[PDB]
Each structure stands twice: as structure tokens, then as C-alpha cells.
RNA sequence: GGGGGGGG
DNA sequence: CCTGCATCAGAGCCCGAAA
């Protein structure tokens, strides 16, 4: 069906989690020698998606006959790497934190 | 975080604003498990707020967080959305486009009002997809992939290419724009007449609408692709169909300078 | 149609109108240095004097053109609307006129030269304050206009 | 622009804006007054 | 009520319009609270979406107009008139 | 100017309707290879190449000239849009 | 401290290179080359290892850096996206599979199906000897043979349909 | 040819050395040429002497030295190094506790050296540091805007060396003092410095209501120590007011001659205004254990007397050039130097506490890094260090003489943009940028010198009673307003004042006075204008707005291979090239030994044999060819200061930014329209307006984690035709014609895990080629560029003398040259601000031509003149006409130049050659000259009833000519102005600017076309362009721009597929950057969703983000 | 806590 | 009740922009 409206509304912590594919646990980015993304860091493929299309991280499942499988060894979905543009993560706060827009 | 030409790395500011958040959350988690005094837990809890507040809207409250050894505020999500360089005004209400080009402007007294002179080397590129298709329907290349290979090197362009182009752009218009586009005739459609040389030829009568001099002005070219876009241009945006001002109702295309002088 | 220096014709009427101006101008300073009328009153009445003198020479420039040189290039281009307006032409043939101090208030002494005649260095420096003030003004304006327009589009686009 | 009655679907609002704004550069109370109004 | 153009603009229904104008966080804050739905009535909204603007060739007045040649037009009409 | 544009604005209540008809029709012919054209071999818009006259490839040129003849009909809710598609592909294949 | 976090002892080595160099420069009255650092570091250190230590120490730069001017220029705006295919590339890859299968079916699709099962249009089904023991239609060394005959029938089939040369780049 | 000089004005003094604002400033800052005792306490010396001694043990500073540069100038340019000297400092460590003293010479790093012409080389590129104008420090009194009868005194120090302070007297009646946006009763401070109620009343009493308004009893209930703590609580709440730390805060704030610095100039101006003498450059002292006032009461005293209308008390005009000074190169750099010194001192005191308080030397105590980085940052990234403008030699000379009011310490986002009456003779009123920056950036006037305190002064002649001395006194704006200063042109017999009424100024106001009344006289007219402005003949006849463009475009003239000086000069074009240093001159008298294309060797009287090598075909920052040409022949005898080689855009040592061309001034069938220009193909034929341009191309081979990049001749899949002009190792051979797509440098890179797709390996399986593992990464020629390879530079890892940034093996550079003939699109201009793009090139047979057959070079439209009011170009060509037939060039000084009767005199002499020859060799008047003459007589141009010869002379004296249209042979119905004009070819060439793009690179995040020709960018269709399509109602054109033609990835790939297959483009999909907006709003915890008619959600991600 | 060398 | 009075978010377009 066709787009006719655009709604905007608050997001519950519940719903933020409904978006999320993984909690980002580490401030790491990419490993300094593999330059591949560190797992549970800010670029982890296990959360956000494969870097290369229809190919897992360690290389066990490498093309499209598997679409949607999650590699046992490395844990990455086999889809189009375009997903790294869409898949949200999330950070579980210890203490709650106010959203400054609604404060100031 | 991308490797740019150099093997160097280049990274968006949000990553450093997230890292500051993650450290503080993580360390608060540990100070809790280790039962630290509340003056310590209080201090981190407040720093956590400020990490969240610089991520969401750095600078909004208190000192803006900066990269070490730089005075540059990190650009936070609010910064991205907002302002002249923000998402809305820089990439949603207006983008850069394909099938466009720019050159210096030159008067073309011999043009008819619906025309302009368009450099053929420009026209080659702006219409290049079309040119490839024509190139194979005749025969100057076996298929579209060889056709493109041929126009890569300037030495390997042979004269019958240009006759192929002329066929392509037949009847089609291009758009001309001179910034600042103050009103709707900052853009107007012209049937292009290919020219040697590198300069666009503008028709004398349209210079007023455009506020176009020839003291080095330049003008952008745009090629409407679909049948729909081309029909809009030819009917609604053709120079010849817009002779009157939409503001006063008076003639906009009119004699001026030499044309008056001679008459 | 061409333009050579001789095509910017100083009217004979010009010298007479200038002598008329100085004899009335010394009328005004005796009324000052004898204390009949103010220094504000005197600055005011010489400004209107030189304004009227400027107008006088402008129509002088065009009457001499129309009657004696009706096909002069400057006359033709201005008259037909091809290019130039009276006070531009007035500056080539008559006098440059009153300039303005940085503050905006005008100088009492005008530029008596024309561009054909050529300005004195002091006339040229005097006239520069106005040019520069105009150039800055226009530069701040286009931003104010640009913003205005975006507001308008924003309020009417639907 | 057409010396004739307006076609259903013309983006008048935009046109109106462009019409008022374009002379903008050349206003020497001048343009401030207009903003004030 | 008389407001000038800036405040008038920022007060339209369309939050995609106002947020893209100015005062973006304020505009977005209040809208998100209200659960505002943009009906995409004006042109900026549809520009932001890359949709086809509701003017010109995009007006619902002229958009659905059909064109048929007479040869097709009654070639079709004959097969559909009978049972 | 577009040949006969003053007449083409005579045709419509609203200028944007003219160009909708024109653009629609222009893709009608490009899809059907022009074979559904209303015009006859001497009305066909021609284009001069180096070899000689050939058909004008530009279907927007075509549609406006077609339109001027008056053999096209235009309007809203003429016919269910799906039912056109195949009877046109039936009469003039691709 | 580093956007690319690096092990704690490796940073300890990097910090040492800098202290080493700074004293070097402090006595030499000019910037040392990697060799003068390498020996000042003792055994195990050559100049290539000074050099690869510094490339590791390199910190990333901000996509939001202003390109001088500071008005209207970001570094990131100068950086092309080389991941997503361009319209030509996506068209070239489509074009290839289009005439790739319109060339297998033109001998027969069966022996082109055996070969197509060998490499894989979408899957990459490439091992070597064994699995072929199962379902192609025949036993095991025959698939390798009809591999060649499909390949060389392809190669004559292509000397006529020589439109694939261009894909060689 | 003969040159004729006009002008009655005898100039007592030549122009000063015009780069002296740069050279003298840095030389004074470094003092490298002075023995360290003898150094005065300025610049580098002053920074050291203010940073040291460093207290705890004490590190003290002995002297500094500067070594010689590790590499010479051109050597630095070649290898992308900075031209700089090693800086060493000898310091003695002294232990306060024991008595140990170890002293060593510590290396502080390198300081960049300035070249002879007053520029720098920073990583291989020339740069210029532009002087900054700002408010002089001192004490100022301005009127209170809100309260009319009141005034604010302000004390303002050097930038970043103290706070600014206001002394508003609030409605309350007390004297209030503003600091750091904080207000408080100033009398609070008064007590702190040891005042009490008697001293305030005895000194100040005269002001009935005002002096008693400062008195507040609760504050005196308190000795000076109490009041010290008083205030500290005011200004940093929460900090415990320890008597120790309140002292330190306010001391460092107010009296610390290290954290607070008024100028050396600020010190004098304060002494002069308040009528005091200052012990140092701080507002107060700490002496004998308590605070001692310096400034505050003279400042308070001055304000109260002005309040009351006491005589001798005046407001200060803050725009007056006596209260505004310039921060030259030296000052600017030493400011950055002192900052880096003070940073290094933070590291010294830190290390004077850790690590063994005895086992330490100066060497291990100092870390150079914070000084090195401070200087490197001032030079590479400061916004006053500019990429040199060396388009032509004048470009760089104007650059050095520029004055910016932006910068760290000037304006930014009318009063300061205005021409102030004190600019006269100091800052050019004409040369300034059109646009947003107008009046913020300006140029040093020609005779102006910047003095020790940084005020601009201008020369003036003293006049005694009535006779004009030859003594010249350079004068700041403040001292100028005391005197009556006569105009430069006022008439004089010998040295006596010859008019009984003289035109003079007094405080910039113009006044008529007698010769008894005059105290000084202007040196020259040139002293009021910049160098560029001074290069405009007949400037007295040009409206200023167009003279403004005449100035600035001379900066932009590109060096022509046939460059020639203008037929009408002003007399400054000789020393411009001399001070430019483009041309090369003779040191002493002597005899030329040898003359080569590459070299010229001269033997002087000294016996020495000096060899001058010549820079030939060197590429400037802007790509224009800097090239010196030998102008003397072997054996020629030469004096001191004679010229030996012409620089670029110089002809026989005169500045040559264009060519003299024969111009007719008439419309021409529409190709003249709205400033376009019509030129004759004759100019291309004889290589007029042809210029050489070199672009530089670079490429690096790097070590990658996939393996090495190698600069190869072996490139997968490419024919020998593609590689013919490549040498053995894969770089193009010197002297090859390279055109777009050609390869200049071969290079292979290892293919990423893009490991040929199964689709690809099968493909190459069939051809029996196995896919190589290296990719073609060669450096090719970009679209629209090209030329002939003239040079290659190859720098590898492991060669002697070379090691590159970490990771890169080898870097190759290829210099490509082009000879660019003039073409339609390219920009011409004259010195009067007439500018136009050449729109048409007619063949010689279409050009209007004179009756004796010679055709004009360029046709300019007259419509360009009346509204622009730049009549100087009109006189320029008249005199050009005379000179064309007489074979002369002329020197008409500005404002003292050739006047109409004088030009007619030489025009008459010219007519005899144009016409007397004609009748001589057997030809009479032409039938067509009679038809023109007929209509000219109807225009009142010729007197009726004279022979055709008599009447053509009358037209020739008006500058007009009989012209025959080459197309018809029939005459132009009127007599037309024709003459020689100086017209430059500006740097804006269409070859540089044409650009077009079908598809190309896209931005990382937004997936929208990149920008800019160099990126194969796409044009920006912005906000106002959408409005344009919106008004037109071009909904489908507009939607195309918003999708297919930008970031609608599916629709853009699909559209491209449709066109190369001949179908119409598919209706678009969702722009990727709206998808980006959604996810950024989710990143702000905002749930934005697309719905349908029935309000059911619509998934814009085609299921790809839902689980 | 908001801003700049060139072209139109 | 109203006014000072404070806190915030605005400040033209496109292209070279010489990092
Ligand atoms: Mg212009
Ligand atoms: Zn895996």
C-alpha cells in the first residue's frame, strides 16, 4: 500500500528495545590489526549486519542460497550489507537518563 | 568509520560521543557492584547524564564536548538534523543531482528564443546513457559496454559518435539555471544546439529574467529524463512559453540594450 | 554608435550656473559670520542650494543634447532606455555633485568636476566614503532579503 | 505570465513568495519596513 | 489573530514543514509529544519524502486524466457492450 | 515556441492537464512501438539524419502533433485503466 | 583514549618511541629517521618496525573536520562511497547474468545445468571431487568430462557470440 | 619606441620598499643577523625574557641562536619541506636549595624563515602572512548610548593578554566597573590599592555630585587586605577566599606583567591621554608587599572631568587610524611563539616536581613539543597564513600588502568597513573586495610605512611660511590632525607657493586657505591609493566602483608568452616588477660574460665571476608559468641596477599583464551584448593572449594489509596502445601528448575480498585466462585536462635522501604543461574595470577595418560605458590611437596626467601619418569617407564647408575614425572611436570550468552525488531551485531530481538500466536520505512511521529492519 | 553559546 | 499589572574552498 501520512511520537524504552538487534557493550570500534569490527562493539556484524553481502564474518556461509541463516561459529546474519544502514542497536543504562530536548 | 584514500581512517563524531557514553555506563555498572560511596556513584550518575546530553544535543547545556586537542564541538544528532547544513535543508529540501553540469556563459545572438548553444563534450556526458543505446542500434560499437569503453579515451572518439548524439537529443530540451534562482525563470528549458568549444550560449532576450551578464557568469545544465519530465519542460518551462512576468504581468522577454538601440 | 571623450558635452550653461551658486553662497556665509542665521540653518540652506544647482545643470545637459545634439550616443542610449539614466549622464557631463560623509550627512562642498573633466584627488577621496557605504549596505541587504524570501516561501508553499 | 485565467494546480503560494522576494535586493524606509510589515 | 510570517510558518499543522523551517528541536519536541500526523498536504512535506508534489502535473485535478485514440476507444467498446 | 502551443492550451481547462495527456500518450507510443499512432505516413514527424529523413524518435513531439489533429480523446474516468492496458497490447503488440 | 582501542602494553611501546625520538631530536638538532630511532631502541628494532609501529599509532580523523574555509566544507563530503555499486556497476552485473544464462541454454540447458551446478549463478557451489558423487544425473568422472565439453562448446559458441570479450575489463 | 612623461609634480621621495611591511617585521622579530648581546627586547628575545626565569630550583634563560637552514629554498619546494632554521637556547639550571648549576644548549625545534621577497615556504608551498588591523590598546572614553549625558571609559589591552574593562556610572550615582561581564562598585577596588577617603576627596573633589557618589562607607570599614578578600568573593563564588589565592588571582588578572600586557603602543597612548608616565605595561604593581596604583585614578580622574564638561577632555573615535594599529608578521608570529614558550613552561614546572630533585639537567627538563606545535599551527592552519597569490608578480605583491580585520582578534559576523578620513594616505580607499568582506580587507597605500608601534604613517612635506621644504616627515593619524596640509598639486614657482588660495585639509575636512596658513604639503597623489589602484591611468576619470574592479583584476591577469607593458602607463610599472623580484638585475657594474636560456654569467668590476641561473617554466601555486627570460646579449656592458632577465608578465622590466590591442568601440550584431567581447582571429594567429599552464599530478604506492601497491608497467588487460608512452617501470615518458583517459602512472593494488565472484571466475574460466590478483589502479588524465608531460619526479622508500610518511613506499609526480590560446568563454578585462568574456572570434575578413586596410583586434560595445562611468578607458584609447601611428608609449600619472588639449596635440601629429602618406602615394579621399562625413556633419562633429582632409582631422581629434565593415565593404554610417587599449586575460578560463556528469561518486551517508568538478560532482539543485520547479508545477521533473537523479538507489540504478535498453525510466522509489532521517530520529528516541490511508504502518525498509 | 582570500 | 530583563535561535544562492 501507499504512504499517505507520517506520524511522530515518543519512543518507550520498551520500543527502543523492539528496534534493537544487540546491546552494544564495549566502546571498541574495529580491531587494530584485523581492522574488522570488534564483537559487541560499535560496528559488530552480529548486531548490525554483514559487511559483505550474503557472507558471514568468519566465512563459513558465503552466498545467497542461505538467506537469513545465522552462522554458528561467528553469529552474523547472511543478508545484504545494506542492513548496516537500518539495524539499530541500543545501550542499557544503569541509571535512567533524561532526554535533554524534553528538559531544556 | 571508513578507510579513505591514504589507508588512513576517518570517522564520524557520533562514535566518540557513543564511546564516552559506553565508558561511563560500563564504569557506573562496576562502581555499583563494588558498592562505592554515594558521592562517587553520584558523580558518575551525573556524568552519565552529560554523556547522554552531548550525544543527543551537544552544547545545548553546559560546555560542548570537543575532540582532544581541538576546539571543534563534536557534531551531535541535533546538530545533524538542524541548520543550513542539517539533514532537512542540505539533503531533503535540496540535493546534488546526476545528469547536470556547469559552464561559463556566452551570448548567442543567432539562437532562436527556444534554443541555447550546448558544448558537445558536455552533451556527450549529460546524455551518455542515451548515447550508448544509440551507439549500438547503429553499429559504432557492438554493445553498450564496448560503447562506453570507447568514450573513455579522448583519442578513441571518432566523428561518427557525434552524429549519433545529434540523433539522441532530437526534440528534447535541457534546463538552464543561473543562481541565485530568485524566481521561477531562474530555470528555463531550451532545445540545445550543440556547439564546438566549451561555453554555453544563452539567448539575449532571456538574460534579464536570469540577471545574466557576460562578465564571467556561469550556468548549470540539467537534463529531464522521463517523458513526463521532458513534457513538463517543453510545455511549462520552455523559454518561449514564458514571455510575461508572473509578478507584474508585464513582458519579461523584451528588447533591451543593443536591440532597443538599433531600433 | 560609439563613445569618445568629446561625446560627454559640458553645457555652456554650466559655468553660469556655478557663478550663480557662489554669489548666493557668499550671501549665506555673511548671514552666518555676521550671526544673522544659525550654523545649522546655514548648512541646511547651502545643501538645498547645491541640490537645485545640480538639477539646473542636469536639465541643462539634456536640453543642450536634445536641441543641439539629438543623436549624441550618451543622449540616445539614455533616452531610448538602452543604457544610463540622467544622473549618470549628469556625472559625465555636468558635475559629480554632493557626496556624503561616512556618517551619512552630506558634505557642504560638492564635487564640481565631472568624469570628462576628471576629479581632484581630494574630490576622489571625498566621494569614496559614499561608494564604500553603499557597497557595505548592499552586502548586508541581500542576506536580509534572502532570509525574508525563505520565510515567505515557508509561509505560502502549501 | 499567461494574460489569462489561472490553471487549476498552479503553485500560487510559491509564485507569490518568489514574486515579492526577487525585487528584494533592490530596495533602498526601504526593505526593513517590508520586513517590519 | 495576526501573526507575522515566521511565527505563522512555525505554527502550521505539518510538522515536516515546520521542523524543516527553523526552531527544529522545539518543533519536533512538541510534535512527538502530541503524536502529530503529517497529512502531506503542502509541498515541502512531499519534497522531503521525494513524493510527487500536489501542484502542477501533480494536482489531483489533472493527474488521472486519460488519453485514448478513437480506433482503440471503440475497439474496446464493442467487446464490452454485448454479453 | 512549441508548434501550435496556443491551440493546445485552447484544448484544456488547465495547462497542467495538457502536459499530463501529452506525457501519458508519449509513453503509450514508446511502449507500443508507435504502431498505435493516429497519424498517417506524411503526417509522421520526421527527423533528418546524415543518410536522410526518418521518423522523429521523440515521442513527446509525436504526441503533441497527434493531439492537434483531434483524433485523441482525453478526460477523467473514461475506461477502467487495467482494461485499456491489454486491449492496447492486443491491437498493437510489443 | 583511542577510538581504535589498542592493547595496553602496545601503547606502552608507542609512548616509548616518542620519548626516544624526542631525546634523539633533542641532541641531533633535527628530526631522526626511523633508523636512528631503531638503534636507539636497542636489539630487535629495525627501521621497518619503527615504521609499522607508527602506522598503528595513527589516530582516525573526523568526518566533520572543516576543509579549511570552515564556512561550508566537511572532509567527509570529499569521500566517495566505494561499497554500494554505482548505477553502471549494478547494470553491468545484471547485464552479465542476463547473457550468462542466455548462453548456457543455447547449447542445451542440461549440460549447461551440470556446469551451472558446478559453479553456481547464485550460491558458488564449488568444491572439487566428492559431492558430485550424488545428484547431477550421472556418476562421477562424467560430470568433469561434460564440464569440458560444455566449456569448449561454450568457447566455440562464444567465438560467434563474442559479446563477452568486453566484460574482461 | 619613445616614451613621453606628463605631469608637473616633482616627487621628493620614491616609493618605500613595498614588501618592507613583511621583511622588516620578521627581521625585527628574529634578529638572527644581530649578535646576541646587542639584541633589543622585542620579538623572540622578548618572549624568552618574559617566560624566564621559571620558579619552583630555578631554570633561567641565557641566549638563543638560530642555525642555518638544513635545506635551501628551492630544495624545500621540491621535496615538500618547510624552509626553516634550527633554534637552540642555552639555559642554566640553578637549584634554589643547594647551589648546583648545570647549563646546556637545548634544541627547541625549527623556526620558519621568510624569503627575500617576504613570503614563506611551508611544506613545499609558498605562503603569505597578512597583517591584521585591530584596536590599539590604551584607555578610551566613548559616549554612553543609553544614557546621553554619561560616558564609559574602557581600558583594553593586547589581545589575549588581559580582560577588557568598562567604567559605566550607573543611574545610582556610584562609579561602576565591568569585568568578565561582571559588574561591581569600582570604589571597592580603590580601597584595595591603599586609597582612603581623604586621598579620593583631595584629588577628585571638583565634581560636586560625582565624587561623593563614588564614596561608600561600608567599603572603607576595612583596611586594604579586607577589601582584597571582599572582591574575590564577588568574582569566583564558591572558592574559599584564602589571602594567598585572592592575591594570586587578582595579581595575575591586573598586575602580573606576564598574564596582562598592554602594548608598548598601549603604554604610550595611555601616557599621552591621561597625562601620566607608566612604569611598565600593567595597570598596577605589587611593590613593598601591597598594591600600588598606576592607571586607575588617572582613568577615573579623566572620566569625571569629561562628565562635567571640563576643558581638555574629549571622546575618542575608535575607527581613527591613530587608535587602530596593525599587527605585522613578526608580531603575529611572536604572539604564537610566546604562547608555545609558556606551554613548554607548564612542562618544565611539572617535571621540576617529579623524578629526583637533583639528578636533572636542562636537556631532560625541557620538552620542545609544545613550542614546535604552536609555531607549526600558526603557519599551517592559521587564518592569516595564506597560500601565496603568485598568479603574476603583482598578485603576490598585493597579497603581502593586504590588511585583514578578520582573524583571531578582529571583526567577523558598518563602522569598521567605512573609509575613515584618516585612511587618507595610509589605507587605499579603492582596493577592497566587493561583497560580504567589503572594507574588512584592504591594502597598504603606496607611500605608507608601518611604524614601531604599528600605526600607519604617510609622508608629508613641511612648508615654512610660504616655501615648501624638501624634508619629509612620516606622520601617524593622531599627529596629522594638528596641522593644515595642502594638496599635492597646488601650484608652485620654484619652491614658493604660487597660489594665493590653496586647497588643503585640516582634520580631513577640506578648507580653502592662504599660503601663510599652510604647514605641510602632500608628497604625491599616489600616496592616497594602493599599488594596484596606482596602476590605473586616467583614474581621475573613472567611477570608484569600477576602479575597484580595475585594481582587483590586475591581481588576476595571467602571464602571457608575448606579454607587453601598456601603451598608457602611470610610472609605477617599473618598480612593481623590481620589488616583485620577478626580473633579475646587476649587482655592481660589469660586463656580461655569457647568456644562455638557462643561465647568464656576468663579470663585475670586482673580478668576481657571478653566475645567475634562471628559473624557466616553474609552476606557481595557481598553475601559471613563472619563467625568466634573458634580456641581454653576450659582451654587453652593464651598470649597477640594469636589467639582465625579464620575469613572467614583465617586458623590459615593466609590468606586462596583458597586450596592447587595436580596439573599435561599436556594437557588433549582438556578440557585444551585455559585456560580451568580440575578438579578431588575428590575435590567435600571432599568439596574443596565449599563456602556459602546468598542472601537478601526484600518486603514492602504499603498503596495504592485502599486499603492496606497485608502480608497474604491467597492468591487467590493457593494450600496448594504452601503454606506449609509458617507460620501463610504468610512468609516462617526458614529452608525450596525454589526453583524458590516458595513463600517466601505472599502479597495481591487491584486490580485496572482492575475490572474483563465482559469476566472474566462470566468465574468465571460459576465456582460459585466470584472474590476476592485482587490480589496475593507475593514475589517468582527468576529463578536460591534458598537455605534454614536461617533468617527472619519483620518490621511493630506500633511496638516499628520501623517506616518506609511514606506510607509503613510493610517490611519483608528473608535471603536465599546456599552451592555452585564447578561446570563447575566456575572460578579458582592462584596468578600468571593464570585463567581459569573449563570445565570438571572427575571421580577419569580418573585422571592421580602417580605409588603409588594417583591421581592429577587438570590438567593445559602447553600452558598457555610460552606466559604469569608467571614462578612463575612453581617454586611454584616444591616446592609444595617437601612439599607434606615432609609435609612442606614454606615462600619464594619476591625477597629474595628460589633459585633453595635450592629447589633441599628439592626435593631430598622428593624423598627418594616417593621412599624409595617403595623399602622398597618389590616393585622394574615398567616396565612402564622404558619405560618412556627410552624416558626421549632420552630427555637429565636423564643421560644415571644409575639405574632407580638414573634416577627418576634426574627427580624428575627437578620437573617431572612418571604419569599413569587412562583411559589406560599406562604411559604418558613423565615425567610430578606435585606438589602442591595454586588455588582460584573467585566470578565469572556460577550459577550467566546463564540467558535466551523467552518474558518478556518491556521498557515504546521504548517497547523494558528491560535489565539485574535481570529484566528478553533481550540480547542487538546492532549496531555491526546487521553488523554481514548484512554481512551474513541474512535479515530475522535480521528483526526478529528488530521487532517480540523486539518492533513490533502486530507481537510479533502474533508470540507468532503462535508458541503455531504450525504455522509459521507472517511477521512483524512496530517497535513501529520507531513510537516513527516519533512523536518525529513532536515534533520538523518536518513533516516526509512514502510514497508509487506513493509518496502518508502511514499512519503508522492505522488511529489512524488522525481526 | 552562531561566520568567511576567489567567481557570478 | 506591567516592565524590565534574561535566555535562545535566527541571520541569501550556486561555484572554485588551495586541506
Ligand atoms: Mg554578471
Ligand atoms: Zn561465520
From TrEMBL, chain G:
Compartment(s) of residence: Cytoplasm
Function, as annotated: Sigma factors are initiation factors that promote the attachment of RNA polymerase to specific initiation sites and are then released. This sigma factor is the primary sigma factor during exponential growth.
Binding site for Mg(2+) 6: 42
Residues in coiled coil: none
Domain annotation RNA polymerase sigma-70: ranges: 128-154
Residues that hold Mg(2+) 5 according to the record: 38, 45
Subunit and partners: Interacts transiently with the RNA polymerase catalytic core.
Species the sequence originates in: Thermus thermophilus (strain ATCC 27634 / DSM 579 / HB8)
UniProt-annotated binding residues for Mg(2+) 3: 38, 42
Listed name of the protein: RNA polymerase sigma factor SigA
Taxonomic lineage: Bacteria, Thermotogati, Deinococcota, Deinococci, Thermales
Residues of the full protein shown: 255 to 423 of 423
